[model samples]
Target: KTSSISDLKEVPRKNITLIRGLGHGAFGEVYEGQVPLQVAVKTLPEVCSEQDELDFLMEALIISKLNHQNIVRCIGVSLQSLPRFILLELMAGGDLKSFLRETRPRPSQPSSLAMLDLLHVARDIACGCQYLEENHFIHRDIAARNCLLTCPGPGRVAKIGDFGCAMLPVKWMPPEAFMEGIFTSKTDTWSFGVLLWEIFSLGYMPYPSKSNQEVLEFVTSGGRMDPPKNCPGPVYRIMTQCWQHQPEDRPNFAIILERIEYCTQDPDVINTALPIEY
Candidate 1:
């Protein structure tokens, strides 16, 4: 006889030692710790509600099965003890959203992000998305905030993180998700477009002037967010393609990744910005 939790790789609770506070996540307080080596830990509160407890376990279960360089790897889980823990590879640069915001051009420091830097971020994300699609798993939440950077630099690798979709972001969702309860790999592609906007715009919120309800209406009516200021024409085209009204019409992750890589090599395509339309 066995329980429903049999397959989970149970990490010994005593093996984990907390170092410092990293940040708070939707379901737990994340910490930087040593499980013999550097690691990030997502811990359940000492006391947790049943639903949240189950949700936390599900995240561990889902991530444990995934194997990819671009996907955040779940080292193991510690559930046999109190305040359960999910150990993950430590990403030194932290979340991509904070990274983008920190590097945004300011009046005090005029230097701006380069096209090649943005392209690398997009390329890493698309690779992860492509892997997810191949595995037949839909990443309901894909945004800069949910991605982590391996280190702090232009060459840092961005890996998709935070599989717990307990908090739904309406602004990053596709029209079909808002109108219907349907979700597929294509819906994630739609969110990838929003993430691209976030990267190029230096972390500005999507649909900057619209409320959630307004976004729903605007998106349902075939309205799309305009290209980020100074965004390259080729890159902007990719964003629009991801936003196609019909999910079937949107480019899959494989195609998206190829186009992004191609842009990286084509100097003219990556360097030229689109002209503002009258």
Candidate 2:
């Protein structure tokens, strides 16, 4: 049932009740557990080799230190002594990918989000980014799939999660990580631009038709996902600034937040006259 790593050998299967599968990847299947209260448990499958377990443990340890509304919370860890588990916060809403899949048809209409609503969500994300940068953390995997909207209500509160690929500033991230490997605060800004695009498009996939490599190359070469139809010009401009080829040219999350906030207060500044274009 519910037990600590030292007592994993004594806990029986009947007591270790499984709630449901949370997620899975090359490392292992993550499940929700109820026996010890609601918690996420990432278990390495029996087929995973020792090296795999080691890598997972190392990654988990580093991720554990990151604690913020935007970052997933690591509760505790149990090294497969028997009831192998890595306890984490059970995000009730799941990840952004799941949310987007459920809300299809892309809410592109101008009325979908009033200017104020847009500013609220953007602010939440910026605050999260500020927290991460303040701690010298870089969320390399900054995309819709990795961000989680823990609570989206009148206030449009949100949280950033899934730090498995997160790291402090690095020389280069894998090509798949949006040329975001050079872990600067601007990396989060780039992701924020993408996130803004996602919200404006009503959760449409970013660069849906392109291959991962092509998407990476496009972004690296100064390409960006087209802003949603009717998106305010200020928002579009900020997204473009985030995707600038020179990382140093990208605005910090704080600057992005200020700009978005300014646009919300004065919608007239958004340059709605421009025809909706990518």
Candidate 3:
């Protein structure tokens, strides 16, 4: 259930001292603020109509109601000003995709992650999605860009973010997303598999530079990522399962939690990033 806009906390314009720009997008600029509290304030475009503002607040209201460790925290909504803002927790590590890339050991430097470490990050994302699933919501856009990290490092916990992009066709959207333009917990499961691929591949792009249309046709022709270079068998198997053309064949977020639990327990499988040598 969502909180009514009238009940949301409204931060006064004077109290919010914009520290600097954090980033910008169609939603307008997101600034790091010191307003009564340190928060990430995202704004709507200045020219947005009342309908646009309501639409923005509508999504923010839903985000504000979601409370889970693996999900991004919504501090409040600031509706008292123009280009009204949505205040969220300050994720020090930034988004997961960029974090993994920045922290990946240079080729000259050996990888610092054990398969277990990578699994932990992946599980963190699945756990959050599971929570959303329990709550009956589907996060249509689930990807490294939508997941946030806690700190500037390899092993920090990851959390899901940006729920406003419901049901858009992109590289991560499941086959059904393209084939039928439908979304469900199952579609999310498909995307989570892609998320796993990104995590263990040290943040590689899922389809490289292929456009979404290329992705749809390619998958239709039974194509998938070549086994990631150096990806262990158990890890790759799970990723392969996630990409199953049949959505019903893929595991939901809860089952994914259990699968990773088992993956981390095997002594041979858990220690190395490469496939276990049986």
Higher-ranked by lDDT: 2 or 3: 3
lDDT at 229, model 2: 64
lDDT score for candidate 2 against the true structure: 0.63
Q: Which stretches of candidate 3 lie over 4 Å from their true place?
A: 165-169, 274-278
lDDT of each: 0.86, 0.63, 0.80
Flag regions of model 2 displaced more than 4 Å.
1-16, 104-118, 151-156, 165-181, 213-221, 267-278
Question: For model 1, how does the per-residue alpha-carbon lDDT over 1-278 read when each residue is reduced to its tens digit?
Answer: 12246666677788889999987887779999887588899999877789888788778878887889999988877888888898898999899999988877665555555667788999999999999999989998899999999998757999999888334588889988877868999999999999999988878899998988888899999999998988888888999999999999999999999999988999886675432222
Candidate 2, clashing residue pairs? Answer: 70-160, 173-181
lDDT of 1: 0.86
Tens digits of per-residue lDDT for model 2 on 1-278? 12333422223444556778866744678888864567667776667778877666665666676667666667666653653566666667666656644543333633333445545656766777888777777776566666666543444356776666333221122223434335567767777777788766656677768766666576566566777766777888988888776677888777877887787777574434322222
Clash count per candidate: 0, 2, 0
| Clashing residue pairs, backbone N/CA/C < 3 A, model 1 | none
Using TM-score as the measure, the top candidate is 1
| Collision count of model 2 | 2
With candidate 3 superimposed using the best TM-score fit, by how many Å does residue 145's alpha carbon deviate from the native? 1.2
The most accurate candidate by lDDT is 1
Alpha-carbon deviation at 196 in model 3, angstroms: 0.7
